[PDB]
Amino acid sequence: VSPKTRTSNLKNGLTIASESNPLVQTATVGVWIDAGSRNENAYNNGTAHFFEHLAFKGTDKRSQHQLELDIENMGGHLNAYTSRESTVYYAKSFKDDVPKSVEILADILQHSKLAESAIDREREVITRELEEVNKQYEEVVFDHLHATAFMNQPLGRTILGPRENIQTITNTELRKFITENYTADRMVLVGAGAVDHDALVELAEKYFSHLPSSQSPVPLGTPIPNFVGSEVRLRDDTMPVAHIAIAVEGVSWTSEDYYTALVAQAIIGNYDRAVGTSRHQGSRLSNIVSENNLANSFQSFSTSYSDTGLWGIYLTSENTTQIDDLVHFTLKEWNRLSTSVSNLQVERAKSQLKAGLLLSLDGTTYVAEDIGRQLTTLGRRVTPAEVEAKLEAVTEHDVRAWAQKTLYDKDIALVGLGPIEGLYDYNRIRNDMSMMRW
Amino acid sequence: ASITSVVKTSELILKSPLLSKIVVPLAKTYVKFSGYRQLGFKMNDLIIEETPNMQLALRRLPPTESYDRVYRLIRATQFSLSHKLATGNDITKPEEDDHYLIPYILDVEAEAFEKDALDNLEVV
Amino acid sequence: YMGWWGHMGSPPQKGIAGYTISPFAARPFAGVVHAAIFNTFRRTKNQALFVILPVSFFYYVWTQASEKNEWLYTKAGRHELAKAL
Amino acid sequence: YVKKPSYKIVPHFLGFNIPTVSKWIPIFGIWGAAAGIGALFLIEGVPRTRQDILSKIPIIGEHWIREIPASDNPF
Amino acid sequence: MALRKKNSLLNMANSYVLDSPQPSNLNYFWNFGSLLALCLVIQLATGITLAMHYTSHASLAFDSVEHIMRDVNFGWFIRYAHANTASFFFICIYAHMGRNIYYGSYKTPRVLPWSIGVIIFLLLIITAFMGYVLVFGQMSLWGATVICNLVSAIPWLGEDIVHFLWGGFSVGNPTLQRFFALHYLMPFVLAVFALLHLIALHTAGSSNPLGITSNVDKLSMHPYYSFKDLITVFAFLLMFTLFVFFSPDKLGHPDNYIPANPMVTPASIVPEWYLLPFYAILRAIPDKLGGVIAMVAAILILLILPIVDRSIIRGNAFKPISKLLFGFFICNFLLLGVLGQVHIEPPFIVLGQICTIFYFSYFLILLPMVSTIENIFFYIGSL
Amino acid sequence: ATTFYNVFVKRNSAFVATILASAFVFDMTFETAIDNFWDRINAGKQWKDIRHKY
Numbered sequence A: 001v002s003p004k005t006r007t008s009n010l011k012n013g014l015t016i017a018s019e020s021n022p023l024v025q026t027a028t029v030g031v032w033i034d035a036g037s038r039n040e041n042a043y044n045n046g047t048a049h050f051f052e053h054l055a056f057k058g059t060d061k062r063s064q065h066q067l068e069l070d071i072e073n074m075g076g077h078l079n080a081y082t083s084r085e086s087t088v089y090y091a092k093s094f095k096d097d098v099p100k101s102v103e104i105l106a107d108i109l110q111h112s113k114l115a116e117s118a119i120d121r122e123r124e125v126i127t128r129e130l131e132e133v134n135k136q137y138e139e140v141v142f143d144h145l146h147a148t149a150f151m152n153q154p155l156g157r158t159i160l161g162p163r164e165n166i167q168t169i170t171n172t173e174l175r176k177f178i179t180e181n182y183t184a185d186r187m188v189l190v191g192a193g194a195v196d197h198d199a200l201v202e203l204a205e206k207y208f209s210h211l212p213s214s215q216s217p218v219p220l221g222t223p224i225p226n227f228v229g230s231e232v233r234l235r236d237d238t239m240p241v242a243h244i245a246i247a248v249e250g251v252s253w254t255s256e257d258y259y260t261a262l263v264a265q266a267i268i269g270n271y272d273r274a275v276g277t278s279r280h281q282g283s284r285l286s287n288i289v290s291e292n293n294l295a296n297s298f299q300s301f302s303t304s305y306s307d308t309g310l311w312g313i314y315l316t317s318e319n320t321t322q323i324d325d326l327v328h329f330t331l332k333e334w335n336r337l338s339t340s341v342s343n344l345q346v347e348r349a350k351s352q353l354k355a356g357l358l359l360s361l362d363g364t365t366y367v368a369e370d371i372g373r374q375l376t377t378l379g380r381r382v383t384p385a386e387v388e389a390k391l392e393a394v395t396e397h398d399v400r401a402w403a404q405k406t407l408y409d410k411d412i413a414l415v416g417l418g419p420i421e422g423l424y425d426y427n428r429i430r431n432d433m434s435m436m437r438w
Numbered sequence B: 001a002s003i004t005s006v007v008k009t010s011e012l013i014l015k016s017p018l019l020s021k022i023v024v025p026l027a028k029t030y031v032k033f034s035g036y037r038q039l040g041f042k043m044n045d046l047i048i049e050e051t052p053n054m055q056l057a058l059r060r061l062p063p064t065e066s067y068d069r070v071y072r073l074i075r076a077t078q079f080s081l082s083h084k085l086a087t088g089n090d091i092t093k094p095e096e097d098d099h100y101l102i103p104y105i106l107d108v109e110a111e112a113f114e115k116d117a118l119d120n121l122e123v124v
Numbered sequence C: 001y002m003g004w005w006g007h008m009g010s011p012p013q014k015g016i017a018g019y020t021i022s023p024f025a026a027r028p029f030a031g032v033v034h035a036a037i038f039n040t041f042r043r044t045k046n047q048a049l050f051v052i053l054p055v056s057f058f059y060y061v062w063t064q065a066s067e068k069n070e071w072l073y074t075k076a077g078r079h080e081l082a083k084a085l
Numbered sequence D: 001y002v003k004k005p006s007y008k009i010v011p012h013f014l015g016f017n018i019p020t021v022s023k024w025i026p027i028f029g030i031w032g033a034a035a036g037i038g039a040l041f042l043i044e045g046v047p048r049t050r051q052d053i054l055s056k057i058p059i060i061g062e063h064w065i066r067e068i069p070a071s072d073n074p075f
Numbered sequence E: 001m002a003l004r005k006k007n008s009l010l011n012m013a014n015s016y017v018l019d020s021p022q023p024s025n026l027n028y029f030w031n032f033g034s035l036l037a038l039c040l041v042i043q044l045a046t047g048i049t050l051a052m053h054y055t056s057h058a059s060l061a062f063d064s065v066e067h068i069m070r071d072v073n074f075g076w077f078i079r080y081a082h083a084n085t086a087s088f089f090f091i092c093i094y095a096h097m098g099r100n101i102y103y104g105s106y107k108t109p110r111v112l113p114w115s116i117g118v119i120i121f122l123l124l125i126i127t128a129f130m131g132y133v134l135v136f137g138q139m140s141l142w143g144a145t146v147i148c149n150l151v152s153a154i155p156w157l158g159e160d161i162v163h164f165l166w167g168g169f170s171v172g173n174p175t176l177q178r179f180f181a182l183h184y185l186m187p188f189v190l191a192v193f194a195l196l197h198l199i200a201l202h203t204a205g206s207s208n209p210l211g212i213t214s215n216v217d218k219l220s221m222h223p224y225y226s227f228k229d230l231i232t233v234f235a236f237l238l239m240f241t242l243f244v245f246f247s248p249d250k251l252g253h254p255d256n257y258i259p260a261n262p263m264v265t266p267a268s269i270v271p272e273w274y275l276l277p278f279y280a281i282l283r284a285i286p287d288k289l290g291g292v293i294a295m296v297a298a299i300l301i302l303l304i305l306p307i308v309d310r311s312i313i314r315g316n317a318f319k320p321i322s323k324l325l326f327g328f329f330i331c332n333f334l335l336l337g338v339l340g341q342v343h344i345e346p347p348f349i350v351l352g353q354i355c356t357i358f359y360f361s362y363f364l365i366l367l368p369m370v371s372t373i374e375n376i377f378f379y380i381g382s383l
Numbered sequence F: 001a002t003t004f005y006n007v008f009v010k011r012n013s014a015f016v017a018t019i020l021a022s023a024f025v026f027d028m029t030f031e032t033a034i035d036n037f038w039d040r041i042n043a044g045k046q047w048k049d050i051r052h053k054y
């Protein structure tokens, strides 16, 4: 039984949420913000990611160099990431170095210099990042997958933004973004590990009390996405491994089908030829793929956003002549979520998930990420008891019903990268989304 | 039928004293009249191998056993086309008729049958 | 299950040396007399029971059936025929 | 504390089990209807089909009760 | 690369008749395949020639066959060749199926060529039955009558279907003309299936009499089996010659030299000799519909050999008990043939039923039992 | 309209059943409708129109 997640508010509306673990000696405090790339328009797309690079380039008090030294002297580190709907800034430290870290975080968020000289310096750093993500194939595939699934919509935009915006982002636009978006009612100060809740609330009253509140305070995790069945092929015959993602419109965080979608995802599961145990996994697709060497790996995913999601699978394969088989068999396994799944598969996947949702939470950073994510998407931390009850409520009938409404005969977004000559055209892929025998 | 089935049934017979007393002598004469030994085959050389399970078992044979099996098949094929029988050292003596393959196929099948069972398990 | 020349799907072979001679170097009918007599006798002797048993049984059955049938349609077989119908 | 995972093996044959097959029972039903409708449709022209099946259907059945007037039938 | 391998069309020929890798120990029973191809070619050549002289109209059919016999140059030979080769076709097809049953050619991985083969066998029967009707002698007509009336057994629609086959109320001109057209066509359908079962076989390659793999020791189809096939071709042609030239009517029924007469029913209506075992199976069942189902089942039951043979060993060369059972099965099949042509009289009535029971019990009881037992005897026997 | 899709289109067994039943209905009604149309455009010309005299 995990210790209770304590939650308090400030006057401005900043949420403070903490989960203490007196077994560890390190703590992760940070700020989860319900804001990300999605909050930009097309002209300032890239701002959020730009800011993340400039948050560390010095404040009104500490210069870039002083900042470096201050964190080095703490002992731990700081880390940040911006996604489409969420921005996170956290600091991992020692138990008694938490007051220093909260102070540094408060400083870099509220009182950042954003000096023209530093904007101009980062403008090249970020321009060079455009030509080096090119190597991270998984991210290339998923960025194109969002681009196509949510064609010309806010979720479809990249995080880095187009080259053109990087050259034209001013300190004015940066200032305006963090003034409009980084408001107290959209932020959660999270602490996990060796933190006292009451100590953390005091530190929040000391550092984050003069945060702006938004004009119209909506609750945390408040949102129109119109998925486009589509494909991007980025054929590259010189690449040895093909990477393919296939996705349908998935479920939002607050969907009633959120757990049903997770169970369905677990029925297909993951596979990796590099892991020893994978050849023995229960998943039907895992068996087909391992016996036939159709793939190096596959990873089912169910990504959620505030108002939509993608649910699908990401496949990697060197077997370039049998990609057709790999995709064929994959989509026919999805068909079986609609036609065939029984309590056997559903109960197996529920068992796997009942543990899986808890096993992910290892160290303090994972716990902090869990508290932060849940608070900024649902407005509360869901207790393991509630999670266990919601999973238990998923029946075979629910999985079939969900698949028949979500997957069966539905448009897909499909991205192929690499030697994908063998991947058939959109129609033949989409034709595998139903079974004529059923 | 599966080698597993054949082996299990045979073990049921060899257990029962009565059954073995009447079956063992019959089976020995059967094998003598079968006459595969007259072409220099071992019993296991005759087992149908065009199944995925048996292909796997054959791949698992130690190199030496494998090379000798190939020789016995080639030699037997040559006796067959010549309409001759083995003579002398080419005839399989009863002591040389070892079940070299049975352990490998039993292991292959054991895993394939476990796989079938486990594909049908129901969380209680 | 079968490949083609060069990848036929044999398990690896090693250690067998095969020898043969030209068809022009060999007498095609060498030892034909011995084979035609001794080899054919051997092969025939070893298979004779599997042919004799079923042939003899079914010929006996047919012989009994045909003889009874013939006899039933004589004068002598009038009564037995009347009962059989 | 749990010592052993708790499961049984359901009876199966050629990789089919009763939970799976029972999900497909309705589908065989519909395909059987499709085959029935299709078969009957193909032999709707057969005079026996009209006489014995189609003319007995209520309301609709009069569609298949058609007589050639005796004056216009050479045979 | 050599032309025969480079060029797509030549390479298909090459793959089947020249470089095709064969087991090096095929015995003479592997020669029936090619003899059946030779029969098929002779039937096509003679049949197409007969078609140039035959008239399908019932008022002229029988006479057109007499015209072929008497007036057309070598007509006698072409007609007798066609009629006798029909018999040889069945001898070779039974031999070929016999080879396949004895040597377990129906087992995995050759279930598909076996199963297509069972269809070829049905098509051969239909082809040969229709061809027989085309003479329009007494046996032609009465055979057609009896055999087409079996369809009357189909419940509810049977009668209607028979009149549809006949194109009328009895076997007559419409039937004869449609049988001509179909008899011409069916051999082409048969050739397609023959080719399909070969293509299906080519994945596994031929079985061999030991029932072990031949992957270890292959021989090119040519020249070795080319020249071996010539021996049986000349043996076949010698047997062909003795029938066609010296006893052309030995295998025929005299009643077929009397013109069809729908009034007079011939003394005994028997089918051609090669259909006689199925005819005996039909007579064994007293029920009309039962008899038809049994007759059809006697052919379609071949399709279950892959299932009911439980042996871990392919074929009978090494299985003494299976060999004895096979011997009895074959002799029973010949007894059925003989009972097909006797009169329906005691004691052949009861005998026919017992032979029919033995025929089916081979597939359903004995082969499954015997094959299970021999599995055990090989294992215990070699411990 | 979801409901219509779900019932008659989603399962192919159902969709093929629906297509064949519709083909049956079409076949019967089209036959009757053409019969009537053909009789109207060829009025007083056909045997059925003059038969009554005899």
Ligand code: HEM
Pocket: E029, E030, E031, E032, E033, E034, E036, E037, E040, E093, E096, E097, E100, E105, E106, E110, E113, E114, E116, E117, E118, E120, E121, E190, E194, E197, E198, E201, E205, E206, E207, E208
């Ligand atoms: C027109 C009739 C047919 C022709 C021309 C034909 C021809 C052939 C040929 C040329 C082969 C390869 C060589 C051989 O094994 O003899 C073959 C193999 C085979 N045929 Fe046929 N066939 C015919 C009918 C049938 C029938 C009726 C069956 C089965 C009921 C059958 C089953 C097979 C099988 C199973 C093989 C593989 C046997 C093996 O090589 O082990 N065929 N056929």
Ligand code: HEM
Pocket: E040, E043, E044, E046, E047, E048, E049, E050, E051, E054, E065, E079, E082, E083, E086, E089, E127, E128, E129, E130, E131, E132, E133, E134, E135, E183, E184, E187, E188, E190
């Ligand atoms: C598998 C191939 C064939 C078989 C088994 C076969 C069998 C027969 C049989 C059994 C008859 C009765 C023969 C008689 O007693 O006179 C016959 C007659 C006939 N067949 Fe075929 N036939 C075959 C192919 C063909 C083909 C391809 C033609 C092309 C038209 C053809 C044309 C004829 C004709 C015209 C007759 C009637 C003349 C006659 O009886 O000789 N046949 N056939």
Ligand SMILES: CCCCCCCCCCCCO[C@@H]1O[C@H](CO)[C@@H](O[C@H]2O[C@H](CO)[C@@H](O)[C@H](O)[C@H]2O)[C@H](O)[C@H]1O
Pocket: C003, C004, E005, E008, E011, E012, E013, E014, E015, E016, E017, E019, E199, E202
């Ligand atoms: C029997 C009469 C002669 C005509 C040939 C019979 C017609 C049927 C041929 C068409 C069927 C397809 O036949 C198929 O073709 C290809 C190439 O030709 C063969 O392919 C085989 O040979 C070629 C080279 O010889 C290789 O590239 C290949 O690895 C091997 O599998 C198949 O094993 C055969 O199944």
